[PDB]
Design a protein around this ligand. Structure first.
Ligand SMILES: [Mn+2]
Ligand SMILES: [Mn+2]
Ligand SMILES: [Zn+2]
Ligand SMILES: [Zn+2]
Lengths: 611, 602
DNA sequence: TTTTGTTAAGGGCTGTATCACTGTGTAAGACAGGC
DNA sequence: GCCTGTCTTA
DNA sequence: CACAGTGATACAGCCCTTAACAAAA
């Protein structure tokens, strides 16, 4: 074979073709034997389907250098959870074996971290924020905010770290600079324009359940994560507000920028308020000022709108002074009781507010009309503690479906048992009704039975097909008509709470939602009297009573869902194991800085480069 | 021509393409690739562009700006990257640099096949007894066909293993480069094939709790290639020997199981097939092709990697609290305490099998105590032949414990107070602790460890403790005792005492006898019929073990961490495959081939 | 006169979209003490 | 016409 | 439960490969 033999030999075996090629080059290509042989070999390589070696030859002939910028190295390190030691091994190995420095060393990545972390860029607030420092070089700060720790004081059992809220807002904005400029471009606006931008910031807070690592005698360790999500940025260009940025995946863990991480129980009110109050204070202060910050060389100004929607009901109730979820006062939007909400199905309005709730706590505290505890509690509608966070409670598209399906399932079981006709039934009769329904759904609808309510059972059960199925088990067909119309009203309502923008996607559904929920409740009250027990769920109450008001308040439902942060805990634990110094004070800030970096849109752009 | 696009260059070169294809098919059988590569390389050399030419030769050899899939495997395995995480890095680097620096996942899998057992062919002459001759066998079920029906004994374990010979093959092929280069380094010929002898340390330990969160225990049966010698004429010249014998890096995993090392039924059931295979290889030659030449290997298996509890379990002996304290000899705790130094290695696997048979058959119709004295502790049938040794650590610890007791008792002067109470001795100990903290900065200890022994066993410490002893005649004795200890220590602590301390190795028996004599004269107070296996072995068996193994220190607590690592991050979360993936991953982690790449910066 | 596109049928690498599979977090109910 | 952790699994 | 996230696996999409016209330049 040619490649077995030596250069003198291969030259011997190829001399004839070499002479022919020199002739071809001089007669057609001006004597470039080098270029002609290169092209011949590249095209031969492409012919044998070996594109890899051909492209590598192309890159080495072009001399185009392969060097990853330290920011890309950081992107990979962060997004694959490599520790410093592991990254260093990979770096030194690739550099030693290819001779080229494809990955950058660790100090370069640290320096690139500095840009993407709070405390790097300068900024100004006009007018300066009330009770907030004007220093711009603040990074990670102790989450206790100088909380007293002497042995005399209350015992401090938690470790927490946080960013300064304005500083974190600056870091997040600078991170999305490229998307802001590209969004202005895509809206036919100018890169250099600086007119006032408005930032709609979604605020969130949740407990992360258990965080313990354990070798049994598991001592639990709970955590609280205080976060914010830039939802949209608009620019005033006229009497018009042009949407230059809108978060594509608003419930993702990718854009949920961690602001404060603490090892404490969300039910531990003393510590919750001690850690969170300084954040709330900076947030308040920013509500009354404009941020000037240099982007692409042009100073810009930003006005903020904080909307605390990332709070599940338990945390809403805790921070807004309300009673625990088992209370008679079931809604965090109005003053209805469970009985009231069960009898009055559709006509309620969003009457609670942070101010009213502050007021009601003061009424509770001072007892100004010298009332008994039952009368006082009635007066203040269950606001028996002082609220300390203004929230905007909502509902997720999931729970609307869930509540409706629970009700329809119970209706199916009772309509199989003809309770419209027989008031009483033993436990055995109802159990056989449910067995009949579950068997028939498994047979005709391929629906597994479930012992516990859940989302996709609801999704698959709330179909007209299932109504035909269950009607195959009902004697009277007037009740067939009733069930078909009830499910028709359900299907006329569902698009409003599921769509991403109901104002645009299903304007007739949104316009007729209130009329349809009225007819829904009227059908339940006339042709379904039996299913009234004075009981109802917050999910059903909110679905029938507050969906149109919540849409008009927020524009949508499905996007302010409670769905994503179930990944957070996992994320947290990972960072604590593989990327954190093993010391209580440092591990927290290492988790914080790694979580910050994991959320930066810059590095995520590098990690989606192929598209 | 170069400023032109693809269709353009294809057209304007179509004529030369037809002529070149004709010449290539007519002269080289249609091998157009070889002809254009050699043409371009020769043209590049012709223009004195040796850099560009050597770089293309390296791209065709895969050494520059393109990582060989084996090097990607080395990096991925050795940094614990999952396939998903590796793929993310691969695709991102490729997309941003345009070049395919890392190789795709399929290429790493194909390179894995080579480094795993079951790839190369080999032969055993004569064929191994009861072992299949198929050579394409890799990971196999560690239960080895153990019955699992509900009627049978309940199987609570999952295990995966290699066939022992197949693993030996893969391990030698891994070190092929080291063997050939060692042959060169001994001024021998690469092509020699005369019988290579491979010494193989065999090892076993349980790995504690493995669970990710009930305890889940694991056993690891593993081996280490310790030395490979070749025969030229009638000298046995060593061609390779491992530099770090006790490293996790060269401890090749053979079988991994989720079972308790004290679960004797399951342990025997799983490990007996590997012992059968090893028994079979003990009388056969391995023919194996390296660098084109068929070579021949014969193996020596030495099960020295067994801590005492596992030794006693697999060799049929009683538990550690027994009166038969030594696994090298028949001494009782009382005997070893009185005699101390004149003992010899007596026990062997065959003697233990026959002592079990004597226990079982009771041929002389003796009572249980007479029978136990007859079989010297072998009440269970052995099933693994071990080479029980000692750890240099335990020699130091046993000696240091004895010296600590002697110090506290010389402070309390126990010879003058035979009826001393518990609290008086406790205050003696407190005195010694306080003064050692004052003079040597030694924090008192609830338990004994190596660092304590290391700092305490000094002559200056003896001076410090003499500062609390009234009689100077006893200063003489304590200082001579410590001097003998310091003479004996190098012998058991070196990695090759026949070069590093030959004077001490020679004088060892004299020194041990003088040490025991001084204990039996001046220090009679600390005789109470009790002694530790570690001290017995240090005073009685160190020279014999050196004669047997040449080294003490040369023959697993990271094992737990490494097993857990691989299970959590690199394995399918399914009982069916987790062990498979863990074993394969550990095996790859131990290959000298990938390790070379990871050390490329040297 | 010099560069590229293009048709049609069809052949390998490569990229990603799943497979199957279990641990695990979260939460939905069940249930029992308030001696 | 109860409240509220603990526990069990889905 | 739902889903995350493992290594293995199946499937689709990739740029071509024969001749010829020919459109842009
Ligand atoms: Mn919560
Ligand atoms: Mn052990
Ligand atoms: Zn309400
Ligand atoms: Zn002995």
């Amino acid at each position: 074979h040619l490649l077995s033999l030596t250069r003198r030999a291969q030259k011997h075996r190829l001399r004839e073709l070499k002479i022919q090629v020199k002739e071809f080059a001089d007669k057609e290509e001006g004597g470039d034997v080098k270029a002609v042989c290169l092209t011949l070999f590249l095209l031969a390589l492409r012919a044998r389907n070996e594109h890899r070696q051909a492209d590598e030859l192309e890159a080495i002939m072009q001399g185009r250098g392969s060097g990853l910028q330290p920011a890309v190295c950081l992107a990979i390190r962060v997004n694959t959870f490599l520790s410093c030691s592991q990254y260093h091994k990979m770096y030194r190995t690739v550099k030693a074996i290819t001779g080229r420095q494809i990955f950058q060393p660790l100090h370069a990545l640290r320096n690139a971290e500095k840009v993407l972390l709070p405390g790097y860029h300068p900024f100004e607030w006009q007018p300066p924020l009330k009770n907030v420092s004007s220093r711009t070089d603040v990074g990670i700060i102790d989450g206790l905010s100088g909380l007293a720790s002497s042995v005399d004081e209350y015992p401090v059992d938690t470790i927490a770290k946080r960013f300064r809220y304005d500083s974190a807002l600056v870091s997040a904005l600078m991170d999305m600079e490229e998307d802001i400029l590209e969004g202005m471009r895509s809206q036919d606006l100018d890169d250099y324009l600086n007119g006032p931008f408005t930032v709609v910031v979604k605020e969130s807070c949740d407990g992360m359940g258990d965080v313990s690592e354990k070798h049994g005698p598991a001592v639990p360790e709970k955590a609280v994560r205080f976060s914010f999500t830039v939802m949209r940025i608009t620019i005033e260009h006229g009497s018009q507000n042009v949407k230059v940025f809108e978060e594509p995946k608003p419930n993702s863990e990718l854009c949920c920028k961690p602001l404060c991480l603490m090892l404490a129980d969300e039910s531990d009110h003393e510590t919750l308020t001690a850690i969170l109050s300084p954040l709330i204070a900076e947030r308040e202060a920013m509500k009354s000022s404009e941020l000037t910050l240099e982007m692409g060389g042009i100073p810009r100004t930003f006005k903020f709108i904080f909307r605390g929607t990332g709070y599940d009901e338990k945390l809403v109730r805790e921070v807004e002074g309300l009673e625990a979820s088992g209370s008679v006062y079931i809604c965090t939007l109005c003053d209805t009781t469970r009985l009231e909400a069960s009898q009055n199905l559709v006509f309620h309005s969003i009457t609670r507010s942070h101010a009213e709730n502050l007021q009601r706590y003061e009424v509770w505290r001072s007892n100004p009309y010298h009332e008994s505890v039952e009368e006082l509690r009635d007066r203040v509608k269950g606001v028996s503690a002082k609220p300390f966070i203004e929230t905007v409670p909502s509902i997720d598209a999931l729970h609307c479906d869930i509540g409706n399906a629970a009700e329809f399932y119970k209706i199916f079981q009772l309509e199989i048992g003809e309770v419209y006709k027989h008031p009483n039934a033993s436990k055995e009769e109802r159990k056989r009704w449910q067995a009949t329904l579950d068997k028939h759904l498994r047979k005709r609808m391929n629906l597994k039975p479930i012992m516990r309510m859940n989302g996709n059972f609801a999704r698959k059960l709330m179909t007209q097909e299932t109504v035909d199925a269950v009607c195959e088990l009902i004697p009277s067909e007037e009740r067939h008509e009733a069930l078909r119309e009830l499910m028709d009203l359900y299907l006329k309502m569902k698009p409003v709470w599921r769509s991403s923008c109901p104002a645009k996607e299903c304007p007739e559904s949104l316009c007729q939602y209130s009329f349809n929920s009225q007819r829904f409740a009227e059908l339940l009250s006339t042709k379904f009297k039996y299913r009234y027990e004075g009981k109802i769920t917050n999910y059903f109450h909110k679905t029938l009573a507050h969906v149109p008001e919540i849409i008009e308040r927020d524009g949508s439902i499905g996007a302010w869902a409670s769905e994503g942060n179930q990944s957070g805990n996992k994320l947290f634990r990972r960072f604590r194991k593989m990327n954190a110094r093993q010391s209580k004070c440092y591990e927290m800030e290492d988790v914080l800085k790694h979580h910050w970096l994991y959320t930066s849109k810059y590095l995520q752009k590098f990690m989606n480069a192929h598209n």
